Amino acid sequence: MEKQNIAVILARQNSKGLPLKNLRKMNGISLLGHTINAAISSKCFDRIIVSTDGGLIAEEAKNFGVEVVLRPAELASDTASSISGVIHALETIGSNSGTVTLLQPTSPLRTGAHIREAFSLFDEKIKGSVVSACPMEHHPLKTLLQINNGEYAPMRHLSDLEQPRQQLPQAFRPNGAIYINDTASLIANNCFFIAPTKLYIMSHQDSIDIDTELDLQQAENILNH
Amino acid sequence: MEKQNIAVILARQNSKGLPLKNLRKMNGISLLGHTINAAISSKCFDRIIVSTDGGLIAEEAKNFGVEVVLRPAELASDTASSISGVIHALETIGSNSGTVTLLQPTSPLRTGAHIREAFSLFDEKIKGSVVSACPMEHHPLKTLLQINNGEYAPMRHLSDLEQPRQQLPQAFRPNGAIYINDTASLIANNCFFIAPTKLYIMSHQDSIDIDTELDLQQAENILNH
Ligand SMILES: CC(=O)N[C@H]1[C@H]([C@H](O)[C@H](O)CO)O[C@](OP(=O)(O)OC[C@H]2O[C@@H](n3ccc(N)nc3=O)[C@H](O)[C@@H]2O)(C(=O)O)C[C@@H]1O
Ligand SMILES: CC(=O)N[C@H]1[C@H]([C@H](O)[C@H](O)CO)O[C@](OP(=O)(O)OC[C@H]2O[C@@H](n3ccc(N)nc3=O)[C@H](O)[C@@H]2O)(C(=O)O)C[C@@H]1O
Ligand SMILES: [Ca+2]
Ligand SMILES: [Ca+2]
Secondary structure, eight states: OOOEEEEEEEOOSOOSSSTTGGGOEETTEEHHHHHHHHHHHHTOOSEEEEEESOHHHHHHHHHTTOEEEEOOGGGSSTTOOHHHHHHHHHHHHTOOSEEEEEOOTTOTTOOHHHHHHHHTTOOTTTOOOEEEEEEOSSOTTSOEEEEETTEEEESSOGGGGGSOGGGSOOEEEEEEEEEEEEHHHHHHHTSSOOSSOEEEEOOTGGGOOOOSHHHHHHHHHHHOO | OOOEEEEEEEOOSOOSSSTTGGGOEETTEEHHHHHHHHHHHHTOOSEEEEEESOHHHHHHHHHTTOEEEEOOGGGSSTTOOHHHHHHHHHHHHTOOSEEEEEOOTTOTTOOHHHHHHHHTTOOTTTOOOEEEEEEOSSOTTSOEEEEETTEEEESSOGGGGGSOGGGSOOEEEEEEEEEEEEHHHHHHHTSSOOSSOEEEEOOTGGGOOOOSHHHHHHHHHHHOO
């Protein structure tokens, strides 16, 4: 096979929250369109695929000049895993060698430059994931986990709960915007986090994820800096 | 000595953020007053002390009918630890036996009922802390910690990052509203988290902490249910 860099944008029609979320407009452009534009402007991809079950989403993708994979209902339900959708897209276009990047439409402030910056961290020899991430608002060592009913244990040391944050290791969470993997590795492991995983760090501002109407408005306000 | 249940409300005059924050009004009552009212209505305390360096805060505390400890400047600076303020209050009134509870004015939706509910968890024989806490918005096992420059390691397992949250242990963070300790233990350990620490769980709504003008408005709106 030819090695290919593939972008997969999963955009199902039924959004369990905000209705028709993937086509909702932000500064005049659909969420889908913002992420398609990021994929194109990154110049990182040989193939850009929108995977959907919805006719309106498919028409939007075609109007932006990218490929469409149609998902049957069982891969677009509320319970369907993202990994099964990415696997189905790769099987449909016939790629099992190269890289595959998931780009969620719910991260509209993730730009093509962010994608290029993340790609520069990918190690073609070692082939761990590159995942975009942002700093944790509340430090995860300053937490306790339930071990029994009404019984809790510190995440690490009890003394961590009173340590100045600057004296603790820096902590990060995935923000959903970018997951880059070696294609054969993603197929074999059937997941998005493959060791050794590297992080591409983004600001809290650029990590906004759209769930609510107020999220859409905040993202618009951020664009209008 | 007589064993005493002491409440200490630390309320310094200089707020590094919102100016004069501890006297800012919320539905007509100062933040200080809301927490004093919680301490009184809990009926958990033999002594209620407001510790401050500020004349206006001291006058407000006296008007609510509680005791005042005056802190010298070195215990009320931007760098001064909360524990040193609680230790100084206990030394001033001469108590080293019983319980001591820190009640921060920045948690105005923490009520007297919350204080009673937390106190019911305190174990007078084993004498670990009781700390009020709320659920973590982002699960702390779904994080990575920096171990070297540009090198990160999962908090626990890499597979935790893709686990449904409901399949992970429940996680909680202190919310700042209540810290209950055995008095002799707090003096000896010079800290607020003493094993075995128990958690009193509060909702995200009741855990609001005041840092901004918008925080004050949100807390007011919550009160007006
Ligand atoms: C990679 C992955 O597991 N993605 C999941 C993400 C991820 O964990 C977070 O965003 C990280 O912060 O979480 C979810 O993210 P969510 O349900 O909002 O979906 C994000 C975007 O992906 C599309 N989608 C999702 C699943 C699927 N089978 N097909 C799809 O087309 C949606 O239409 C939307 O554009 C979640 O909220 O539960 C579910 C997603 O499946
Ligand atoms: C127990 C403890 O360590 N408290 C600290 C808390 C705590 O960790 C969080 O609230 C938990 O979510 O964090 C701080 O909390 P913060 O600075 O807002 O202070 C909270 C309240 O305590 C008063 N205060 C604080 C310290 C001190 N030496 N004297 C005081 O009178 C303030 O006037 C205000 O009413 C922080 O933001 O850094 C600093 C506080 O010292
Ligand atoms: Ca989501
Ligand atoms: Ca604070």
